[PDB]
Amino acid sequence: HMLDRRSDKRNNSDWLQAKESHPTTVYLLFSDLNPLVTLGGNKESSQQPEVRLCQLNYPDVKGYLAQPEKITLVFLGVELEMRKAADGLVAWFALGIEPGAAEEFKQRHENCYFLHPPMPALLQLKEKEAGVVAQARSVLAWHSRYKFCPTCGSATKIEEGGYKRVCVRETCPSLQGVHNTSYPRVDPVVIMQVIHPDGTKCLLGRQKRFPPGMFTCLAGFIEPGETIEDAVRREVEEESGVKVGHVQYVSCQPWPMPSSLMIGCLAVAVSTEIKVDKNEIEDARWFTREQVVDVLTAFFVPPSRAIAHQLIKHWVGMNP
Amino acid sequence: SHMLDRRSDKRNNSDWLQAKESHPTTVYLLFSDLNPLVTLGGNKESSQQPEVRLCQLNYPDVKGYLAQPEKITLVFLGVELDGLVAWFALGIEPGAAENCYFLHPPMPALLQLKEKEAGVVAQARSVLAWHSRYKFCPTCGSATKIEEGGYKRVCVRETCPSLQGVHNTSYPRVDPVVIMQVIHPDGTKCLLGRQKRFPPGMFTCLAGFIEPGETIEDAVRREVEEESGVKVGHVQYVSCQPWPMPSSLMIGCLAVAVSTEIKVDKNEIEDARWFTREQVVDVLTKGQAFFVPPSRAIAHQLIKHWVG
Numbered sequence: 364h365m366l367d368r369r370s371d372k373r374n375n376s377d378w379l380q381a382k383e384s385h386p387t388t389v390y391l392l393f394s395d396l397n398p399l400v401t402l403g404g405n406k407e408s409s410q411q412p413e414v415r416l417c418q419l420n421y422p423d424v425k426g427y428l429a430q431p432e433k434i435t436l437v438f439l440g441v442e443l444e445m446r447k448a449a450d451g452l453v454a455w456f457a458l459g460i461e462p463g464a465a466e467e468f469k470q471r472h473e474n475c476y477f478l479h480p481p482m483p484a485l486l487q488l489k490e491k492e493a494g495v496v497a498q499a500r501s502v503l504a505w506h507s508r509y510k511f512c513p514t515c516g517s518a519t520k521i522e523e524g525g526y527k528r529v530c531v532r533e534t535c536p537s538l539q540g541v542h543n544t545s546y547p548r549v550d551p552v553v554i555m556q557v558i559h560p561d562g563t564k565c566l567l568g569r570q571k572r573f574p575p576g577m578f579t580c581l582a583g584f585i586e587p588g589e590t591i592e593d594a595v596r597r598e599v600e601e602e603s604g605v606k607v608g609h610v611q612y613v614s615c616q617p618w619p620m621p622s623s624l625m626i627g628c629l630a631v632a633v634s635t636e637i638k639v640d641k642n643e644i645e646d647a648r649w650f651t652r653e654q655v656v657d658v659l660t661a662f663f664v665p666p667s668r669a670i671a672h673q674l675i676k677h678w679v680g681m682n683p
Numbered sequence: 684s685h686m687l688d689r690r691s692d693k694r695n696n697s698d699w700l701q702a703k704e705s706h707p708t709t710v711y712l713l714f715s716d717l718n719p720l721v722t723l724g725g726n727k728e729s730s731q732q733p734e735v736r737l738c739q740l741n742y743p744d745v746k747g748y749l750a751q752p753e754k755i756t757l758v759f760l761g762v763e764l765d766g767l768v769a770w771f772a773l774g775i776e777p778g779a780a781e782n783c784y785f786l787h788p789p790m791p792a793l794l795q796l797k798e799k800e801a802g803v804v805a806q807a808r809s810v811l812a813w814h815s816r817y818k819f820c821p822t823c824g825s826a827t828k829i830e831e832g833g834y835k836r837v838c839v840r841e842t843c844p845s846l847q848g849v850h851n852t853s854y855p856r857v858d859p860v861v862i863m864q865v866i867h868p869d870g871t872k873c874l875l876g877r878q879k880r881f882p883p884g885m886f887t888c889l890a891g892f893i894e895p896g897e898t899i900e901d902a903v904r905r906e907v908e909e910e911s912g913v914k915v916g917h918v919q920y921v922s923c924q925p926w927p928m929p930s931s932l933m934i935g936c937l938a939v940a941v942s943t944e945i946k947v948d949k950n951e952i953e954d955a956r957w958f959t960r961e962q963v964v965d966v967l968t969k970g971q972a973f974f975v976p977p978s979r980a981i982a983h984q985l986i987k988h989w990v991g
């Protein structure tokens with residue numbers, strides 16, 4: 364990650380309040396969960412215009428901050444190097460604002476714009492910036508849909524730097540002991556590059572909503588009581604009929620749509636017959652290594668920053 | 684291999700689920716306050732020591748509970764691996780709850796179940812626990828209704844945003860947790876810690892929840908450094924263990940420290956130390972003024988994996 368989350372500061376109201384108006388503090392502005400970005404404008408993002416975060420400071424956002432009931436403020440962390448309250452730490456916050464306010468901003472700064480739609484525009488951000496966006500967007504998305512207490516239905520209030528919501532009903536069981544109802548949600552999702560029993564093909568599928576010709580790795584949410592490997596085997600068989608043996612973890616990608624942790628795996632199929640569950644996917648097929656090589660250089664796959672692309676590209680290079 | 688095929692394709696088949704409720708081969712697992720009904724001994728597996736196993740009930744054992752649907756919670760677990768033997772979990776109230784008994788307390792008594800039965804309890808307990816604490820719509824606060832064999836809750840307010848599109852507010856929660864065996868730079872020691880609440884002498888792997896926006900490996904590095912001050916480099920995934928307290932997925936990793944100095948937070952972790960392979964070997968066998976979780980806990984499996 365690009366920041367140190369400094370979760371120990373989340374219950375330090377005085378420190379958080381002081382940092383809000385400190386001149387070194389960085390703000391990332393969000394409207395309807397979309398981050399404010401800019402194209403080009405420095406050396407790295409120049410040779411072809413690259414999308415980068417529009418980093419704001421207190422003088423840019425002070426008017427939003429002075430209406431706390433209309434904003435959602437999340438402490439993201441501090442920069443990894445300290446500069447020469449006044450502790451040398453450079454704080455970052457995510458600031459979610461109302462649409463009226465965002466319009467008045469868009470007329471104020473012409474070079475910055477809100478990134479949308481989230482898929483695939485978030486894949487345009489460089490890795491370090493994409494990670495902080497995934498943190499900020501996932502927490503703001505949680506706040507947008509978890510305003511009421513799941514245990515009793517009452518209103519809740521934000522606490523702990525944006526990382527906790529607390530029911531206002533004093534008698535509520537959610538307030539006795541520690542419960543996940545207080546805290547942001549992380550949904551684990553397995554996504555799997557599935558290799559044919561003969562090592563020369565891989566299994567890819569699509570949903571009816573996908574652009575014509577796009578195919579990608581099968582994926583699904585891990586269920587309660589399931590391991591990573593269990594979910595890979597179950598989801599592949601559900602959607603495509605294919606039975607899976609060995610499952611190998613490869614890498615992760617946080618995917619803030621709203622709050623998914625993509626757990627990327629390589630899996631070896633032990634059967635070949637395909638039986639598509641139309642209620643989930645429209646199509647699943649075996650693609651030869653040669654076909655996939657042709658496409659990485661009559662179907663196509665997600666862009667290179669998507670984990671599915673990284674899994675497919677990794678496989679193309681493995682020893683058959 | 685597993686006890687059950689989840690057959691999630693059946694969860695929206697209300698006619699099939701209903702037919703199975705009274706079928707003579709259907710098995711029910713009874714839960715009181717999220718604790719499973721179990722039994723000790725009584726088959727070939729206990730010829731040596733009495734072993735805990737699930738107390739499998741059938742329709743005539745639970746039919747009085749089913750006659751009061753507003754007082755129970757019913758979850759379709761799957762079919763054994765139409766000839767299909769359906770399993771359900773049935774959560775009841777403490778009042779309604781002599782060779783069976785409710786397994787309590789969950790830590791460490793759940794660790795007495797054999798792995799294949801532990802997997803079914805983790806499924807059932809976590810879904811039941813979700814229903815206990817997620818009865819209202821997080822998006823608007825209205826009441827909700829159970830659907831899909833116990834795997835969905837649906838807001839009763841027709842205009843609610845939760846009903847336009849697909850949203851995680853409808854579905855069971857799974858909380859990813861990293862737990863990590865952390866090896867000293869010199870390769871000869873591992874880092875273990877404890878909380879004040881722990882029984883005296885107990886040490887275990889550090890662990891913590893993955894945050895929004897974070898990878899497995901970054902959560903390991905962040906939590907180790909938060910809790911113990913130790914900085915971590917390489918992180919390797921090893922294996923998982925679902926832990927239904929209420930709904931955690933323990934993601935077990937081996938990590939290499941790149942610093943040596945410990946600095947404990949004295950808020951979550953009251954103590955953390957480097958333990959040599961010899962100290963740990965002694966404690967996996969039996970001799971040391973400390974001890975670790977039992978063998979079915981993923982921390983014990985990770986510590987064992989490390990010593991070879």
Ligand SMILES: Nc1ncnc2c1ncn2[C@@H]1O[C@H](COP(=O)(O)O)[C@@H](O)[C@H]1O
Pocket residue numbers: 550582583584598643849850851854855
């Ligand atoms: N946490 C969640 N967020 C969104 N959808 C979920 C979640 N858990 C289960 N689902 C269901 O999972 C479906 C997607 O299938 P899959 O991604 O293959 O598991 C969605 O259409 C939902 O019905």
Ligand SMILES: Nc1ncnc2c1ncn2[C@@H]1O[C@H](COP(=O)(O)O)[C@@H](O)[C@H]1O
Pocket residue numbers: 541542543546547858890891892906951
């Ligand atoms: N899903 C969750 N369930 C319970 N506690 C959580 C959750 N997410 C964050 N927390 C917090 O994490 C603390 C435990 O620390 P750790 O397990 O080391 O991350 C709890 O006491 C809560 O304050």
Ligand SMILES: [Mg+2]
Pocket residue numbers: 581582583584598602643
């Ligand atoms: Mg899927």
Ligand SMILES: [Mg+2]
Pocket residue numbers: 583584598
């Ligand atoms: Mg699924």
Ligand SMILES: [Mg+2]
Pocket residue numbers: 582583584598601602643
């Ligand atoms: Mg699926």
Ligand SMILES: [Mg+2]
Pocket residue numbers: 889890891892906910951
């Ligand atoms: Mg911890």
Ligand SMILES: [Mg+2]
Pocket residue numbers: 890891892906909910951
């Ligand atoms: Mg911790």
Ligand SMILES: [Mg+2]
Pocket residue numbers: 891892906
């Ligand atoms: Mg933590």
Ligand SMILES: [Zn+2]
Pocket residue numbers: 512513514515516517530531532535536537
């Ligand atoms: Zn409440």
Ligand SMILES: [Zn+2]
Pocket residue numbers: 820821822823824825838839840843844845
């Ligand atoms: Zn609602």
